[PDB]
Design a binder for these strands. Structure first.
Ligand SMILES: [Mg+2]
Ligand SMILES: [Mg+2]
Ligand SMILES: [Mg+2]
Ligand SMILES: [Mg+2]
Ligand SMILES: [Mg+2]
Ligand SMILES: [Mg+2]
Ligand SMILES: [Mg+2]
Ligand SMILES: [Mg+2]
Ligand SMILES: [Mg+2]
Ligand SMILES: [Mg+2]
Ligand SMILES: [Mg+2]
Ligand SMILES: [Mg+2]
Ligand SMILES: [Mg+2]
Ligand SMILES: [Mg+2]
Ligand SMILES: [Mg+2]
Ligand SMILES: [Mg+2]
Ligand SMILES: [Zn+2]
Lengths: 304, 148, 166, 211, 287, 152, 108
RNA sequence: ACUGAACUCCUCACACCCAAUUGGACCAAUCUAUCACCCUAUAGAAGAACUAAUGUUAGUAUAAGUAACAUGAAAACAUUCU
């Protein structure tokens, strides 16, 4: 007989266990707010060739943004909700080309996780995260596991790859999935309006692999590349990414610095391990803007 | 065929040749009808040849039953409990002398397939091959890419 | 028609000795000409083939299929004749050792198709066979570990012979 | 069904009309529905002559000997399930009352020597003789299962049995056979049984409650 | 030797079972009415000193075997594997009843006795472990206690975490063995025959025999281990699902010898908890 | 693809599904307890609680009289909706109906369900109780609460 | 389109005996504490709900007797009372459905 | 140089690899004559032998538990509603 946590509790204990476990969740999250008052791993400066951490954010939704040339740039909002570094493995024990950080996002109930996973976060000192994503990273960027990661890890002007699971569309047919033209409506056309036509040729007595057929469209990891950060909102930990992000609203995206060969040496001015508000040097404003971004509160712009 | 039929190894009963040879055939059981053309050459075998056969090997005890049978049989029973029942139905006297002598000569092993044509129980005398025959040892028992 | 399964509750054994373990009872009960098919009865018959009778009654009170109620009738009837006729002291102390289902004598009806052509429907009947055995249910077979596979592979390596020679 | 009246009322409701047909052959019974006068344990010489005028050679001073030999031999036929002998030894009113429930189970009843001289008790009387006999014996039972495992009484230990065995005779070819066996309400209970019994209470419909 | 203590004590336990069963009047048969809320009014016409309440459950269903844990035999708590005595009325008591007070108490006592069964077979051969008692600790206190006296060598000893983890591994190993609890209502004299080599349990049986108008003392057994208790117990070791030996404390008025009290907490197969709720019940059971 | 489509398509159209929910809602305003298949039960639960929320607008509100005139196919139930059901529930703001599952229908094996209105004269359903507070685990957690009240 | 050959019983047994076609052993099943008939979790006990259904059936029959004809739904709340029970001080101004049996142990 | 056949040798045994066709030796079961008598013998006869005719009749498979099929709703099963 499989059980669950709400099963054997009376009405007296259910709000007690809800409020109590939620209170240890908020206390364990708020205990990580002093990473530099702990003993962190030593902070190295940036080097040409080094890679750093990403984030895991929520896709809040979209909103328009206008540059000082008076142009709409549609902007996705990505809220960084309780992102943390979970484990560091070097390239020795990873046996890849590069080191790796497991980084997790969006705290989730402790009653819906496997006991091995709850031993992992019980050792770590955190409530369990929904997603763990793994970042290839060099030895220069290696923060202690358990350190909070904020939105000012990225700065405006930076170009960013964002990956996610796209919106699942289920078993879709040929025209919606692969964009095939289908058949005419009238002029005969008995039972073909949305069907694939031929598949292969008669001499090939089989169908080639990778043939476009109906099947489950969506619900897979894709990555959008080279997306400019226009604005970060420090108080609510929002990234204002250009354009469109894969995935539905309130989905968790994996936000890392862009791999594009035109944007591979602009980390000279970015905070290289991560941004530390514990470091207390020149505390950031409410909201960081790119040079082009027409701020609200600025007067109505003139092109003269 | 051989995959539908069982098989066995070539053996004897109690090391049948080593010390002495023991006749492996205990009992013959003839059942021969008095009036009937099926057991005619059986009757002529009892009148002529079963007495001289019974004297040529006294370790076999023979039971001629002489009941109204409709097919005559001979039932050879062997020292190991094996019982081979073969029919002497409409067979001449010479063919029953070769048949009964065939049952006398053999043993109570099965007439299923024999796998090997031979049976040593001590096949190797100079010591069987293992992969370290025909390999010289090295000094201090060292293996390749071993320094000390 | 053969009806050999009703006879199997009639086999009387000679009385035992003091130096002999207690024999578990065996209870053969079946129903004939159930209007249901023989391979929709295979899933319900297969479901309960090692469970105890209280567990099987629990699994058949809550299954949506038609045969579950009929098999629960057979199991309740065999529990009652288990206690009365067959000297089984505890009702709970019974497991289903065999639960099969043969086919019954079916009927043949005419199914009309789209032209003068037609087909031959069968009104499908089945049976349902049960041997209950007194005792705790046997434990499920544990899956063999890497110790068992390792000993089996090494036992095959120890088994082998130089072949096609002396 | 449960009785004749339910089959007759379902014969009227179903419409199956069974006309009562008359046949010249009736059933030649050889028994009685029980006892003519039930002897109650803690003058009937007219019935003795009512036996001697049909039988003409009958001695009661020799009868409880034969009553023993009719008794024990009949129970010996339970050791072997010799029903062919039993219908010569026992009546038809007694034969299901002693052979039905013993089906599919081996009994190993065994007599050992009596404790009292068995004796006649009363005699009553188309004509059905009837002799009740008092016996006080020592018997051993061992009733097994289909599976040959003991469920009533050890085989070795003898028990002492009170027996009010009622005999009946058809009075041209019949003999004395065990008709019934009076069990009195003052008698002690029998042996206890090796196993335990659950006895269910009232099976409740949902609208019903238990009181 | 402790192996000799198992041989001699278990043989005295078997002499008490032999002189306990051989006074039966050759299978006398007493009936017991199932007084309960459900399946009401079924008499069990059962054997006198052979049948248990578990046999009544085996007449009803496998559900009443697996789920039911104590039996109110005429208003008193009774073990499911205790032999009955006379005509009576049986309730069956589970953990999920409306007022499961005696079931919680019997689970408490059973877990303490399993704990002492782990402690006495925990140490190496050169350390004398000497179990005194289990105090009747309420369930709200969060942990069943078991007072233990050790040797003077370990007067300055305190176990690590992995010692307690080895105690839990031995206790879960004792759960996996699936051992029933043999029970015997014995007079005081044979209980003093069994526990004559432990002065604390001699005084404990002297406490229990004088409490009653008879000299009657309950005795229990798991497997090769005999212990005294105050009330009934669980039917089996298989019911304890979660089990942890949480901590060890030392008592404060220890002038003669350390009465070193061990702490445990456990939940059945029926009242399981989640991993986080169970870790918090471990954080509470170390006091 | 039906992301965010929140209405069960039923019946033989949108019109006939609103007549199905209108007949079920009429039957539950009348009898105050209904066995029905489960999807129709929770669809009609969504309509039933809003129907009381129009019941609280008052007898005199002509919009709510048009609504209750639509949704109640029997006309006697409209004084029951404005004088019985709406004063019964004026204390609370939501949670008017309760739903439980029946064992499945013996005809076709459909997922059945009951919704009743809370607080009526009918024999109350065998509601699923929590485990009582005196069980072993609830007393361990009661001990944990009695400690963590003593930490202030 | 027609099958080119006939599927065999070894292939068919591999199809219709895999665990995707077999019936799952379910573990939702409990014992109802009020009745002891084994119920299922998340679903009411059929025996206890059959009690409630039969009593609501007799109550609605007496409702149908005391109203009389269709379209007689009262503007008045209802109270079911059993034999040997006074209508409450709270039941003033409510219609009364007198029953014939006793108050159940489970009606309150 | 070795490998390499159903060729050839070797130990024993030999009537024992072609279509259509043709020659010959035997022979299952059945019945008849006469023996026989847990199933046979010598003859005589004949509706005298089926892995194949989109063969016929019956059984049961496969396709397949598939295609298809069927009950408006609540309720006191009085009734009402759509
Ligand atoms: Mg078209
Ligand atoms: Mg066309
Ligand atoms: Mg068919
Ligand atoms: Mg539909
Ligand atoms: Mg060669
Ligand atoms: Mg050649
Ligand atoms: Mg040749
Ligand atoms: Mg012939
Ligand atoms: Mg022909
Ligand atoms: Mg054929
Ligand atoms: Mg051919
Ligand atoms: Mg053919
Ligand atoms: Mg099929
Ligand atoms: Mg179907
Ligand atoms: Mg198909
Ligand atoms: Mg279909
Ligand atoms: Zn219930």
């Amino acid at each position: 007989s499989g059980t669950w946590w709400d099963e054997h509790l009376s009405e007296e204990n259910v709000p007690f266990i809800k409020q109590l476990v939620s209170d240890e969740d908020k206390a364990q999250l708020a205990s990580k707010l002093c990473p530099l008052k702990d003993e962190p791993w030593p902070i190295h400066p940036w080097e040409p060739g080094s890679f750093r951490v990403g984030l895991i954010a929520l896709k809040l939704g979209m909103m328009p943004l206008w540059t000082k040339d008076g142009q709409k740039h549609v902007v996705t909002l990505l809220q960084v909700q309780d992102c943390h570094v979970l484990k560091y493995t070097s390239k020795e024990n990873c046996n890849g080309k590069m080191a790796t950080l497991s980084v997790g996002g969006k705290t989730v109930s402790r009653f819906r996780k496997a006991t091995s996973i709850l031993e992992f976060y019980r050792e770590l000192g955190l409530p369990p995260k929904q997603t763990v994503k793994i970042f290839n990273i060099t030895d220069n960027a290696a923060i202690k596991p358990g350190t909070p990661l904020y939105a000012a890890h990225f700065r405006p002007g930076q170009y960013v790859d964002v990956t996610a699971k796209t919106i699942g569309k289920g078993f879709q047919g040929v025209m919606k999935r692969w964009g095939f033209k289908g058949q005419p409506a009238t002029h005969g056309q008995t039972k073909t309006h949305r069907r694939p036509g031929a598949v292969a040729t008669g001499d090939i007595g089989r169908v080639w692999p990778g043939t476009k057929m109906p099947g489950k469209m969506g619900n897979i990891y894709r990555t959008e590349y080279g997306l400019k950060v226009w604005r970060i909102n420090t108080k609510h930990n929002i990234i204002y990414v250009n354009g469109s992000v894969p995935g539905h609203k309130n989905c968790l995206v994996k936000v890392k610095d862009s791999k594009l060969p035109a944007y591979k040496d602009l980390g000279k001015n970015l905070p290289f391990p991560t941004y530390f508000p514990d470091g207390d040097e020149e505390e950031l404003p409410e909201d960081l803007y790119d040079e082009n971004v027409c701020q609200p509160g600025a007067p109505s712009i003139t092109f003269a | 065929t051989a995959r539908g039929t069982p098989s066995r190894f070539l053996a004897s009963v109690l090391h049948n040749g080593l010390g002495r040879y023991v006749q492996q055939l205990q009992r013959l059981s003839f059942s021969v009808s008095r009036d009937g053309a099926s057991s005619r050459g059986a009757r002529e075998f009892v009148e002529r040849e079963v007495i001289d056969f019974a004297r040529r090997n006294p370790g076999v005890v023979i039971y001629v039953n002489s009941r109204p049978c409709c097919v005559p049989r001979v039932v050879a029973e062997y020292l190991n409990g094996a019982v081979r029942e073969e029919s002497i139905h409409c067979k001449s006297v010479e063919e029953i002398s070769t048949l009964v002598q065939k049952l006398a000569d053999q043993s109570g092993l099965d007439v299923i397939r024999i796998r090997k044509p031979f049976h040593t129980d001590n096949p190797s005398i100079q010591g069987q091959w293992h992969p370290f025959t025909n390999k010289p040892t090295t000094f201090r028992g060292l293996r390749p890419r071993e320094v000390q | 028609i053969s009806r050999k399964w009703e006879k199997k509750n009639k086999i009387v054994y000679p009385p035992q000795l003091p130096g002999e373990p207690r024999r578990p009872a065996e209870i053969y009960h079946c129903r004939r000409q159930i209007k249901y098919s023989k391979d929709k009865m295979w899933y319900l018959a297969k479901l309960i083939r090692g469970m105890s009778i209280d567990q099987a009654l629990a699994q058949l009170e809550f299954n949506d299929k038609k045969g579950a109620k009929i098999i629960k009738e057979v199991l309740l009837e065999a529990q009652d004749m288990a206690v009365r006729d067959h000297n089984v002291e505890f009702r709970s102390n019974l497991y289903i050792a065999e639960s099969t289902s043969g086919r019954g004598q079916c009927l043949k009806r005419i199914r009309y198709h789209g032209r003068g052509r037609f087909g031959i429907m069968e009104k499908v009947y089945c049976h349902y066979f049960v041997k209950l055995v007194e005792g705790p249910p046997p434990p499920p077979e544990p899956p063999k570990t890497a110790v068992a596979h390792a000993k089996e592979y090494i036992q095959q390596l120890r088994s082998r012979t130089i072949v096609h020679t002396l | 069904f449960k009785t004749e009246k339910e089959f007759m009322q379902h014969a009227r409701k179903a419409g199956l009309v069974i006309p009562p047909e008359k046949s010249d052959r009736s059933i030649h019974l050889a028994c009685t529905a029980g006892i003519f006068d039930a002897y109650v344990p803690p003058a009937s010489q007219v019935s003795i002559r009512r036996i001697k005028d049909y039988d003409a050679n009958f001695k009661i001073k020799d009868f409880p000997e034969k009553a023993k030999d009719i008794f024990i031999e009949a129970h010996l036929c339970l050791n072997n399930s010799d029903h062919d002998r039993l219908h010569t030894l026992v009546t038809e009113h007694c034969f299901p009352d002693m052979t039905w429930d013993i089906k599919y189970k081996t009994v190993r009843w065994s007599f050992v020597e009596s404790l009292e001289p068995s004796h006649v008790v009363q005699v009553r009387c188309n004509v059905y003789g009837q002799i009740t006999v008092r016996m006080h014996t020592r018997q051993t039972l061992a009733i097994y299962d289909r599976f040959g495992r003991l469920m009533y009484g050890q085989e070795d230990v003898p028990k002492d049995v009170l027996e009010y065995v009622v005999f009946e005779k058809q009075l041209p070819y019949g003999s004395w056979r065990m008709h019934t066996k009076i069990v009195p309400p003052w008698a002690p209970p029998k042996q206890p049984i090796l196993k335990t019994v659950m006895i269910p209470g009232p099976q409740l419909k949902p609208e019903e409650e238990y009181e | 030797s402790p192996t000799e203590l198992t041989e001699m004590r278990n043989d005295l336990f078997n002499k008490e079972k032999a002189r306990q069963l051989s006074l039966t009047p050759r299978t006398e048969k007493i009936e017991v009415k199932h007084v309960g809320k459900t399946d009401p009014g079924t008499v069990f016409v059962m054997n006198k000193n052979i049948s248990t309440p578990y046999s009544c459950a085996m007449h009803l269903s496998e559900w009443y075997c697996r789920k039911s844990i104590l039996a109110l035999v005429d208003g008193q708590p009774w073990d499911m594997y205790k032999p009955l005595t006379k005509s009576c009325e049986i309730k069956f008591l589970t953990f999920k009843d409306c007022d499961p007070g005696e079931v919680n108490k019997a689970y408490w006592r059973s877990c303490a006795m399993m704990m002492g069964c782990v402690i006495e077979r925990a140490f190496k051969d050169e350390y004398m472990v000497n179990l005194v008692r289990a105090p009747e600790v309420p369930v709200i206190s969060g942990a069943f206690c078991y007072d233990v006296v050790l040797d003077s060598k370990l007067d300055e000893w305190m176990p690590t975490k992995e010692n307690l983890r080895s105690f839990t591994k031995d206790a879960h190993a004792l759960i996996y063995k699936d051992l029933p609890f043999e029970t015997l209502e014995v007079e005081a004299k044979v209980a003093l025959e069994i526990f004559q080599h432990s002065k604390y349990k001699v005084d404990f049986i002297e406490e229990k025999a004088s409490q009653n108008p008879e000299r009657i003392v309950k005795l229990h057994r798991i497997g090769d281990f005999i212990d005294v208790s105050e009330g009934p117990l669980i039917p089996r070791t298989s019911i304890c699902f979660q089990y942890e030996v949480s901590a060890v404390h030392n008592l404060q008025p220890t002038q003669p010898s350390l009465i070193r009290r061990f702490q445990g907490v456990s939940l059945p197969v029926h009242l399981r908890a989640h991993f986080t709720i169970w870790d918090k019940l471990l954080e509470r059971s170390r006091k | 693809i039906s992301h965010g489509r929140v209405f069960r398509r039923m019946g033989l159209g949108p019109e006939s599904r609103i007549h199905l929910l209108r007949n079920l809602l009429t039957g539950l305003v009348r009898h105050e307890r209904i066995e029905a298949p489960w999807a129709r039960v929770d669809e009609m639960r969504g309509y039933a609680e809003k129907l009381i929320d129009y019941g609280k607008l008052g007898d005199t509100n002509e919009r709510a009289m048009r609504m209750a005139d639509f949704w109640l196919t029997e006309k006697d139930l409209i004084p029951k909706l404005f004088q019985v059901l709406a004063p019964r529930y004026k204390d609370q703001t939501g949670g008017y109906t309760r739903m439980l599952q029946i064992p499945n229908r013996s005809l076709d094996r459909a997922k059945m369900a009951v919704i009743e209105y809370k607080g009526n004269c009918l024999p109350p359903l065998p509601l699923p109780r929590r485990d009582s507070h005196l069980t072993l685990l609830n007393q361990l957690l009661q001990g944990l609460r009695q400690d963590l009240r003593q930490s202030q | 389109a027609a099958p080119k050959n006939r599927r065999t019983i070894e292939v068919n047994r591999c199809r219709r005996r895999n665990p995707q076609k077999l019936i799952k052993v379910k573990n939702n099943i409990d014992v109802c504490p009020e009745c002891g008939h084994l119920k299922q979790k998340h679903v009411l006990c059929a025996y206890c709900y059959e009690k409630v259904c039969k009593e609501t059936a007799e109550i609605r029959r007496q409702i149908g007797k005391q109203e009389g004809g269709p379209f007689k739904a009262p503007t008045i709340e209802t109270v079911v009372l059993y034999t040997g029970e006074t209508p409450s001080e709270q039941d003033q101004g409510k219609r009364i459905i007198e029953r014939d049996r006793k108050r159940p142990s489970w009606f309150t």
